[PDB]
Structures are given as structure tokens and as C-alpha cells.
Amino acid sequence: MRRPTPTVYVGRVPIGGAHPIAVQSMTNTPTRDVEATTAQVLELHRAGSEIVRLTVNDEEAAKAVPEIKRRLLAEGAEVPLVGDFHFNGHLLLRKYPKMAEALDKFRINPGTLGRGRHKDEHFAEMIRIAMDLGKPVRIGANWGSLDPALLTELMDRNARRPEPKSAHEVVLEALVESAVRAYEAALEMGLGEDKLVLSAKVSKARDLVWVYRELARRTQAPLHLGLTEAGMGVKGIVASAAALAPLLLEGIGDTIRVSLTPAPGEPRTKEVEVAQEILQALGLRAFAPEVTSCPGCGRTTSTFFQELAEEVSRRLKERLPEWRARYPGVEELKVAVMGCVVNGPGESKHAHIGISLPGAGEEPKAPVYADGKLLTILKGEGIAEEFLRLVEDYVKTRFAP
Amino acid sequence: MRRPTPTVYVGRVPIGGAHPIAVQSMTNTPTRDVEATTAQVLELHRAGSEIVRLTVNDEEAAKAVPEIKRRLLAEGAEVPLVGDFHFNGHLLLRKYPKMAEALDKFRINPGTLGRGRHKDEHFAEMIRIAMDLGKPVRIGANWGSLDPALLTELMDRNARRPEPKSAHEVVLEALVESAVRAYEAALEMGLGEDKLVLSAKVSKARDLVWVYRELARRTQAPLHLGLTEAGMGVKGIVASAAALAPLLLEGIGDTIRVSLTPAPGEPRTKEVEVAQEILQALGLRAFAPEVTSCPGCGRTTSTFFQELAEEVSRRLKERLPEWRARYPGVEELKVAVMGCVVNGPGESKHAHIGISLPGAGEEPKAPVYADGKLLTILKGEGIAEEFLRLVEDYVKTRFAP
């Protein structure tokens, strides 16, 4: 099902159809602030960001990049850095060759290159520097910054059609075209297929799916997939997952970024957690053990159910660093915590290990299943710690090296 | 794109391919507790649950149902009630005809009917009561409660194949078959196509998509779609959205339920909010104004951006009850709050109304766009309240009756 693509190395991280779909993120600290940006790169990376982008917006930012990279490497943190360029990227890359070298990838936006005939020169200059340095590039179109000359061209094409499309549909055409024309232009200049990643982001889910199906058909490059400007909170989380899932299940997308707006005080790592959850929900990567639990209903006996499920989740999160080191494959662990006999045994038998609490009408005992069969039956006080000990025992056996 | 289906009325709410996809939920209070369950029905309904299910697990539950329904109707709350039956549904429906009458729909699980030859009688009895009362039925299979006799049948079919499928794939076959055989059996007994809804739930997203594509192909009924036992927190929210989106975008699904495990103390309404967000993210329903906002990055100037976006979201939520009454169509409002010039103007021009804060390097002014064109430019203190006044003015004009 996965769309085949050439491999693009972003630092040490391969992306493309032969490789795991890579999680990425972007900092929100001022790049010029070396200490804050280094810290946040590390934080994002420790949370699971395999690649981290940072804006390189002006000269002070550019001058900070080599120091941020040096500091990362001093602690053995080989997380690749993507520089995000707009308006003056050709100038910054030209003037600050240590920044150009320090980055692991450049992002170009075909809509923020400049005006008129200057755009083609600026593009060429950035591509030249990438070629000279052996750096990969993302050609990243975004409908917030659509090339207006291209939009007019396409508006006029549309108006000649027997049945013109809507204005909105022509915007989506123009976004794809922007990415595809720039891709083809880079290839024609000699940038390798092993050095080009494409994106074409919109902020509405159904539109993203259309756009990426077109990109996937019209190009051979690995694709960086994300719902741009997804918003805050639950809205942003849902929209992101809803937009990505149809494409990922169809085999489209080689790296993802979740564009959440943090609430004030909310950590920048939340977008990384969401990204990881999307991929794991779809069975495309495994990052950590997961808990399957029912919603609970009027059959569930007390608030013990919600508390047990939460406690199991909390313990798995606590054990994971240790586990990941000792027990190869433990990220695939599936644990169930269920509220009653209706679906409790069955669901538990689908998990690696699961517990079925007794609900209404039932004897006060809680069967535990592992590998699809009854393991034991728990009762009394301390069901939670007995269950967690059984989960521990299970992990040691099943995921033993 | 929407799959055509006959219309099934669940109380006053039509479901099927000619109708909006209906949001539903389920209570978690003991049904016998009339006061707690009435209260929670009302809470769920006020949050957007168009249909509400409650477990009817024993005699005391059954005896409460008519009183819960009476109380709802006394306040004009015409939210339909779905009774969830397992093991003894035929007995409860037979013994408590006022409960049978009070419900607006019955849920049957083909896997919780009983043993052997008793299953067919129990099924028939429930279908008979529904026919006699004019009630619709959901035939709701769940892989936590798969009919074992059917699984063995299908296991044996599989073992005769030149290339047998995995055990997991045969479970999914058996789940579909359970729903389809029961559907066909109900139809053959005379229950109308206007009285039958189907579900066949699993707890893994990719499996759900396969299952529902099969149900959709093999049956004509409206489909109740949900990812069962989706779990807690972000995991549960993401998995639910990821599982539903591919199907909903393909036109499959007539009503949805989000099966979140609440954290201790978390409201039961959270699943309703998630359901609504899935549908709105995909452009299938509109419930409330939405805010598109960028993630922010190193180009964003201060924590003002995150604070403004949050404040705009909070104000829209506060205004909505009033708005919904005065301004037909306001649920479709799209507002943008953006961090800098890179995508800020562009994205704002895609919204009904949007503001682009100044980021790094920019003059300290904030253009506001409406209907795709510059409306005004804001500066100084009080940008947030000026913007919200402009949003108010916009709404009055655009969504005037």
C-alpha cells in the first residue's frame, strides 16, 4: 500500500517509501535565542521529534544556527535541523555559509520567494547552495502564501473551461501546480531526487486529501504531510487526525508534522504526541504500549473502572524508558482494561493482556487474559497492583531479547 | 458521495443517506438511578447529542426507563432514547412493556443473545416486540462479543481456502457476517428497512475501515459508525478521528458515537464534543464557529498570539447561544488568528474574517481581512477587543436573517 519513493536523507533520518513515516515538529522560540532554541530542540527530540524545524527569518537567526547545531552535537543529539526560509532565504544562505552548512535541510516556499522575475533567481540561488552543500530541500507550498501570478494564470485557464470550477477549487489547483512546477524546476537544475521533499498544505481536511492525492500522482518525491494552521485544543487535534488518516491509510505521506496552536502555557511537545498517536492509531508505527478501554456505561460498577484504566496508562508511561531498553519490541504492547462481561473478555482476548472488571449483576471477580486465554482471576483490594505485576511479568516473557 | 440509504426515524431524528449524520452518545450512570440518568441524558443532549443510549441491563433498569422518558418529555426534551440490551433483552422487553414503549429504539447484539438454538428465539422475540410497537432496531455487532459458533464456521471455511487468511482477518469476516446475517434475518421476519440500523465495531482504526466498507457494500441499511473501546485522552480522541475520517469522507456512516473513556472527573460530554469536531473537520456538519490559527513559530512576537487565539475561541463559545438564535447560519463562521505575514494575510483571506498579527521584522500593525479583502488595520492596546467587535459586526451583517 505504501507509495514507493526515492529515499531522502534528512541528516541521519531516511524518509521515503522504504522507511518509517518520520515525526517532525518546529520550534516556537526566537531562533536568535540560542539557549531557548537549543533547549526546545532537545525537548522536542526527546519527546519523539525525529526531525526538528526552526525558522531562519533574519540575520540574527542565521548567526545563531551554527551555535545551536554545535551545542546539539556536543551532547550527542544528532537530530536533524530544517531551516524555514521566507522572503530573504537566498540572502541568508549566501551571507551565512556556516548556517547553510549547519542545517540539515532547507525549506523553500515557492510563494515567498519574491516578486516577478526575481522569484526565479532567488529560487535558483537557494537550489544552487543546496546542490553545492549536498543538502536536501523541501519545496513547501502553503495556501496562506500562494503565488499570485500562478493563481491568475490558473484563474484564466479555469474561465476558459466549458464548466468552470469554483474559485476555491482553482486555489487548490494553483497550490498543487506551484509545488509541482517548483519540483520540476529543481530537478531540471540538477538537484537530485534523493534531495527533494514536497508539501502543499491547506487548513481544511477534505481539501488536504484532494491536494495530496494530486501531488502523489503527479510527482515521485517523498511527501511531507500536514494540515497547516489546524488550531487549538481538541479542534486542532481532531482536524489533524481527520485530515491525515485518509491519506496515510492510502499509503501517501513520508513525514508528518501536526500544526497545533498551543494554549498559553501548553508545551510545544503536544504536537509531537499527537503526531505519534496518529501514526500508531493507524498501525503505521509503534511508539509506546497502548491501552484499549471501554467508555464505561451504566453496567460499570463504580468509578474504579475509570481510575484503573488511568492508573494502568500512567504505569505504562512510567515503565516505558526502562522497558524500551530491556525488552525489544515492547512498543507494540496492547493492554485492555474493560468495565464488564459484555465486551470485557472478548476485547481482552484481542489484546496482549487485558482485565475484565465485574460489572452489574456479576460476581465480584475480574478475569485477566493474556495471549487470548485466561491467565488468572483477580479479587479483593489491590486488583490494580496485581494486574500491573501481571503486565510486568508478561512483558518480561513476551518481549524478552 | 454520501451512500444512499432508506430513512430510519429514531424518535423525531431521521438517519440515513438523505439526512445529516447524527451525533449520539451513551450515559454512564446506573439506569435505575432515575435522577442521575435523567440529568445526564439532558446534559448530553444539551451538548449536542441528538440521540442518547442507555443500558437496560436488568429489571430495575427496565423499571426506571418509563420514568426517565416521562421526565424528559415534561421539559420538552424530545431526545430519543436507545435501550442497550444484552443477554436478557427478550425477557426485559416482554416483562416490562411500558419500558419497551418508552424507548425510541432497541439495540440488539447478535453475540449476546444466548447460546445454541435459544439465540434465534431470543432474537425473534425482540424483533417481534419492535414490529408490534413500531420501533427501529440497531443490530450492533462488536468484536468484544463475537458469536463463537459463527467464528468457528468461518474458521473452518478459511482453513479450506487455497491460501488461508490470518486468524485476525477471519475475526473481521465473522463480525461482518454476524451483522449481515442478523440483518437479513430481521428483514425476512418482516421488520422494515425503515426500522433497521447496523453497526459492527472494532477497536482498531484500520480494521474498522475494512469492516465498514464491507457492511456498506453488503447491506442497504443506515450505518451507525464508531470505534469501540477507543480509550482515554488524546489516544482515544485521535484513534476515533483517524478511524472515522476515511469512511466518512467515502460517504459511509449515518450516525456516529465516540467511545472515549473519561478520565476520573472528566465530563461525559467530552465524547459529544469530539463527535461534533470530527464531522465539522470534514465539512459534513457545522455546529459552531471555528478558529483557524497557525502553530506560531520563532517569527511570532510574543505570547500575545497564543493568548489572542484562545481569547477569540473563548468569546465565540460565549456568543454562540445568542448567535444561534439571531443569526441563521452562523455555525458556518470561519475566523482566523495568525502570527505573522508569511501565511497570516493569505489564511485570513480564506476565512470569513481573520487577523494577521505582526511578527518579527514587521511594523507593529495587524491587518484584518473579511470576505477576502482588507477590512482594517489594528494597532496599539486593545487589538483583541477591537477584533472581537469587528467579528461581531461581521456576524450581524453576514448572517442576518
Ligand SMILES: C#CCOP(=O)(O)OP(=O)(O)O
Ligand atoms: C512556520 C510554520 C507553519 O508550519 P506548518 O503549518 O507546518 O506549514 P508549512 O510551513 O507550510 O510546512
Ligand SMILES: C#CCOP(=O)(O)OP(=O)(O)O
Ligand atoms: C455500552 C457500550 C460500548 O459502546 P460502543 O463502544 O459505542 O460499542 P457498541 O455498544 O457495540 O455500539
Ligand code: SF4
Ligand atoms: S464493556 Fe461493559 S461497562 Fe464497558 S462500555 Fe461495554 S457494556 Fe459498558
Ligand code: SF4
Ligand atoms: S503564520 Fe508566521 S508565526 Fe504563524 S506559524 Fe506561520 S510563519 Fe510562524
